[PDB]
Amino acid sequence: SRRWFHPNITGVEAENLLLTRGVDGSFLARPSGDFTLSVRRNGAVTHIKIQNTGDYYDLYGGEKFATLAELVQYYMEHHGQLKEVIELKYPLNCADPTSERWFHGHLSGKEAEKLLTEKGKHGSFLVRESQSHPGDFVLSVRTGDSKVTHVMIRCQELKYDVGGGERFDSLTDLVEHYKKNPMVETLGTVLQLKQPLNTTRINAAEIESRVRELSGFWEEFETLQQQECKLLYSRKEGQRQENKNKNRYKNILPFDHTRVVLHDGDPVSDYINADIIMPEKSYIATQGCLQNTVNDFWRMVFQENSRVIVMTTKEVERGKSKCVKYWPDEYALKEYGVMRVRNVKESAAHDYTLRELKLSKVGQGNTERTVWQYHFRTWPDHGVPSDPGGVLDFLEEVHHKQESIMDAGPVVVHCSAGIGRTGTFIVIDILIDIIREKGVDCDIDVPKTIQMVRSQRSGMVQTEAQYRFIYMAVQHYIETLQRRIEEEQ
């Protein structure tokens, strides 16, 4: 449940709702990549600023978080942490259905039927606004192996109903109740609400038109964000007191089911803030090294047989340490615990530096392997690059290096927290990989890919600017590939 987030509200409106429909301890989150946490305390409303430039959610005077859901979950369980003491006790639920996957609004009866026939299957449903009855809504459900059933949703005195029974405060409450307790037709047909209609999957060749229609991008990104409370998996290992100083940000943690487990350790030696990212080429999404985790990083690269490292941050950004130097200087050899790293040669490009490293275990003669470090240096401090040409050239080289190495392990990708830039780079790579094998005429789904990657590491792809950049990167790759065909013809 992510009902505490109100996507289309103002400051005074948030103050009015908390003072008339809330109590002391009531709270809601709202957008302004700036966000605000409005909390009622001692009969007054306090506004706490949340900033996200692309790395993490930064609550002013508080902690850093991977998701707004994890931020709320933390302060609801840790009282006294939020001080101006500001208590996060009762979420103020939003009735706005615009961020729901099943809500289509603008659709007509003919448009809803045509879309359910072409894209829908058994249990596929949607909620659209009634055309001839303003204020009312229509629930369209597809049942079969087939038929489309329309159920009228009346709006009477701010409450919603299907013509009888219980009256709901919102369309979300109605949909969820008839999801658990399905409606039965007069001839025994069960109106099961199994899954919403997919309207995000597009043909990679027609990306130009979809980018044009979304130029939309905010509404599609917020719909994806509304699905993050379905990915609140266990992060217990990272929360252990022995692993506290192994995390760059104490609340940005790996999932227990995807975390990289370190073996052959010193007699807790199995933890690293990293996750295996498997598209459903593998990836390891991780944070920027800490002074005390450099040895653990090289232990991971060796054990996982990784031959390519993608660094998408500078060592220092805005006077703050984002990643410590875990590699030696050009032509130098350094020992990092049981691991030995040699920097053979450095090759500089306009947007990145390539470092040819040789990793081996100290005291073992035939464990040496080459590890190629691709260090992207031109990514801006805040936001995303204005042109995706540099990132695409960089990711094409990274891909061809990975493919050229026999039995190469997952590609290690990292920035500062290992979720924003790391998430953006991995998602662009996954989406381009589909086009690389199938061609320009293939199905791609940008929010579905991000959601799948987010189930493997919390908060992968942090901002709407990064979300737009992913679309812009795929569009530029399709254009350059189609231009290459025209030049040959």
Residue 57: which residues within 8 A CB-CB, separation 6 or more?
35, 50, 51, 64, 65, 66, 67, 68, 71, 462
Q: Is the dihedral of CA 14, 20, 21, 24 positive or negative?
A: positive
Identify the residue whose tokens are 């305390």. Answer: 41
Pairing mode, strands 308-311 and 274-277: unpaired
Three-state secondary-structure class, residue 476: helix
Q: Is 272 annotated as a binding residue?
A: no
| Single-letter code of the amino acid located at 50 | I
CA distance 146 to 138: 19
Structure tokens of 335?
A: 């020992």
Backbone angles phi, psi at 359, to 5 degrees: -105, 130
Backbone angles phi, psi at 229, to 5 degrees: -75, 0
Instruction: Name the method of structure determination.
Output: X-ray
| Residue 214: its H or E element | helix 207-214
| Residue 26: its H or E element | strand 26-31
| Residue 317: its H or E element | strand 316-317
DSSP string across 196-213: EPP---EEGGGHHHHHHH
CB distance 287 to 416 below 8 Å: yes
Three-state secondary-structure class, residue 360: strand
Using CA atoms, how far residue 262 sits from 138, 259, 265, 301, in Å, is 53, 9, 7, 10
CB distance 414 to 312 below 8 Å: yes
Residue 6: which residues within 8 A CB-CB, separation 6 or more?
14, 17, 28, 29, 30, 92, 94, 96
Identify the residue whose tokens are 């957008």. Answer: 31
Please provide the size of the chain in residues.
Answer: 489
Backbone angles phi, psi at 152, to 5 degrees: -75, 135
| Single-letter code of the amino acid located at 282 | S
Q: Which of 94, 229, 323, 415 is catalytic?
A: 415
CA distance 63 to 73: 13
Pairing mode, strands 44-51 and 124-129: unpaired
Q: Is 153 annotated as a binding residue?
A: no
Pairing mode, strands 195-196 and 124-129: parallel
Nearest to 371 by CA among 295, 310, 459, 318: 310
Strands (E), 205-319: 274-277, 283-286, 308-311, 316-317
Cα Rg of the chain, angstroms: 25
CB distance 300 to 294 below 8 Å: no
SS in 3 state form for 397-428? HHHHHHHCCCCCCCEEEECCCCCCHHHHHHHH
Cα first-last separation, the chain = 54
CA angle 44, 46, 48 (to 5 degrees): 170
Is CATH 3.40.50.720 the classification given to domain 1-99?
A: no
Strand order in the sheet with 274-277: 274-277, 283-286, 411-414, 308-311, 369-376, 352-361, 339-348, 333-336
Backbone angles phi, psi at 91, to 5 degrees: -65, 135
Beta bridge partners of 285: 275, 413
DSSP string across 412-470: EEE-SSSSSHHHHHHHHHHHHHHHHHH-SSSEE-HHHHHHHHHTTSTTSS--HHHHHHH
| Single-letter code of the amino acid located at 156 | Q
| Residue 176: its H or E element | helix 171-180
CA distance 465 to 379: 13
Using CA atoms, how far residue 112 sits from 210, 295, 456, in Å, is 19, 57, 34
Q: Is 419 annotated as a binding residue?
A: yes
Structure tokens of 93?
A: 């639920």
CB distance 26 to 18 below 8 Å: yes
CA distance 120 to 117: 6
Helix, strand, coil content of the chain in percent (nearest 5) = 30, 25, 45
Beta bridge partners of 160: 155, 168
Identify the residue whose tokens are 């598209």. Answer: 279
CB distance 326 to 311 below 8 Å: no
DSSP string across 71-126: HHHHHHHSTTSS-------EE------TT-TTEEET--HHHHHHHHHHT--TTEEE
CA distance 418 to 288: 7
Which residues does the chain break after (C to N > 2.5 Å)? 32, 84, 145, 215, 267, 280
CB distance 4 to 172 below 8 Å: no
CA distance 413 to 403: 16
Q: Give the largest CA-CA distance in the chain.
A: 80
Three-state secondary-structure class, residue 7: coil
Identify the residue whose tokens are 């026999």. Answer: 406
Q: Is 209 annotated as a binding residue?
A: no
Three-state secondary-structure class, residue 220: helix
Backbone angles phi, psi at 69, to 5 degrees: -65, -40
| Single-letter code of the amino acid located at 111 | E
Query: Does residue 415 carry a catalytic annotation?
Result: yes
CA distance 128 to 18: 29
Q: Is 351 annotated as a binding residue?
A: no
CA distance 41 to 276: 42
The residue extents of the domains of the chain are: 1-99, 100-196, 197-489
CA distance 314 to 267: 34
- What is the CATH class of 100-196? alpha beta
Look at the domain 197-489 and name its fold. Protein-Tyrosine Phosphatase; Chain A (3.90.190)
Identify the residue whose tokens are 């605000």. Answer: 36
Nearest to 260 by CA among 246, 249, 276: 276
Structure tokens of 332?
A: 């130098």
Domains 1-99 and 100-196 share a fold: yes
CA distance 181 to 169: 17
